Amino acid sequence: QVQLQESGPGLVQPSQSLSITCTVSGFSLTTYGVHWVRQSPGKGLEWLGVIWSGGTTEYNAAFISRLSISKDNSKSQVFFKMNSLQTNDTAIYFCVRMRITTDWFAYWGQGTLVTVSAAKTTPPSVYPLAPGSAAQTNSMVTLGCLVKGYFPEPVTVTWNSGSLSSGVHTFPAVLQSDLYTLSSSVTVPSSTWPSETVTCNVAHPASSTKVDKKIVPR
């Protein structure tokens, strides 16, 4: 299967540039085009440009003054660079094979969330949420993890190193005092916890942090 793996910085200072490398596996860059697309809540999906198999590039005229796409066929890499980023360039940027005629290589990468800000990288504080010491007991118990005061997005929240995946709600982050906060709940049988350990795992790639917080009865 196709993979379009992206690397590049999440956080870009205003007026500076965004560079993303897309590493292609599963098809030859000498034969197929690769497109770049971004997604924001305000403007939806915007096609930015394409690099065709022979190297010809086409760009969206709205961005052409500050956008560059290039590639290295032998390394199977496609390079995106955009200059002079402002706050309205905040978006998830994707390397994509789309607009297909006959091939089976359509694929959309996981994307790179790009935040355009002069605000500083800050790791999260992670707090376990156990029910109150006088809280009543039910057949299913809800536990949680409060992830507070981080920047920029994203964080990844898992439970029991990703083995506890069902019954989880990880809420969208909200931005307050220039920092993000989110919470995650998990619901498990009362005959399981606390006899069986439940731990939330929080990764914040931008600060290289990985924290585990065991949920302990109060």
Binding site: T101, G132, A134, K148, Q176, S183
Partner: protein, 219 residues
């Protein structure tokens, strides 16, 4: 530029019924090579868009028979037969015939289901947070339907509006429900001035609000 206009913006559908989604282009979209590069994408919650239909009416390899594309000129349609819970998300059309390539605004497919009351849980500040000088009180309102809901905080019986942050999930692909978090943030000092903390949910499934509460002195 070719403007792609989708309708409707939002589409509720029962399980097993058919959904129909429209995309109109502001001009014709025949590429010079003769192909009409009209594509339909589905973006499920938490995921990247995935190709369903290419060149107007061709199902991409692996896409279920329930998805069908049609149309010509400036009028295109996606039909989803026998809708399943896993079909929820945002559907987008795309034209790749005339540069710059453009997307429609999206149509959110919502699954109808039977009403379900929220499961409400309240959490006092953690001992760890209190040690750092903060005090967040968290309330989860989980797995409810329909999506419309209201949450009220009371501190020692008085409604508190300031310092509440709310967040909502997308519709759940397993059970077609919605969830919400509500977090009341105070300083440790404000928190320790009061005793009773209450999260109250109002939802059409109950006549009375659903109340979860704790007393700081009973902790």
């Amino acid at each position: 530029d070719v403007l792609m206009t989708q309708t409707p913006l939002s589409l509720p559908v029962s399980l097993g019924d058919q959904a129909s989604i429209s995309c109109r282009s502001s001009q014709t979209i025949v590429h010079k090579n003769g192909n009409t590069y009209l594509e339909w994408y589905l973006q499920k919650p938490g995921q990247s868009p995935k190709l369903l239909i290419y060149k107007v009416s061709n199902r991409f390899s692996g896409v279920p028979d329930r998805f069908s594309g049609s149309g010509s000129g400036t009028d295109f349609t996606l039909k989803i037969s026998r809708v399943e819970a896993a079909d929820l998300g945002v559907y987008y059309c795309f034209q790749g015939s005339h540069v710059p390539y453009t997307f429609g605004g999206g149509t959110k497919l919502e699954i109808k289901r039977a009403d379900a009351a929220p499961t409400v849980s309240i959490f006092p500040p953690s001992s760890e947070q209190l040690t750092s000088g903060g005090a967040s009180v968290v309330c989860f309102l989980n797995n409810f339907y329909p999506k419309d809901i209201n949450v009220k905080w009371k501190i020692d019986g008085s409604e508190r509006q300031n310092g509440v942050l709310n967040s909502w999930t997308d519709q759940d692909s397993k059970d077609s429900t919605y969830s919400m978090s509500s977090t009341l943030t105070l300083t440790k000092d404000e928190y320790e001035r009061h005793n009773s903390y209450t999260c109250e949910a109002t939802h059409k499934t109950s006549t009375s609000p659903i109340v979860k509460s704790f007393n700081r002195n009973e902790c």
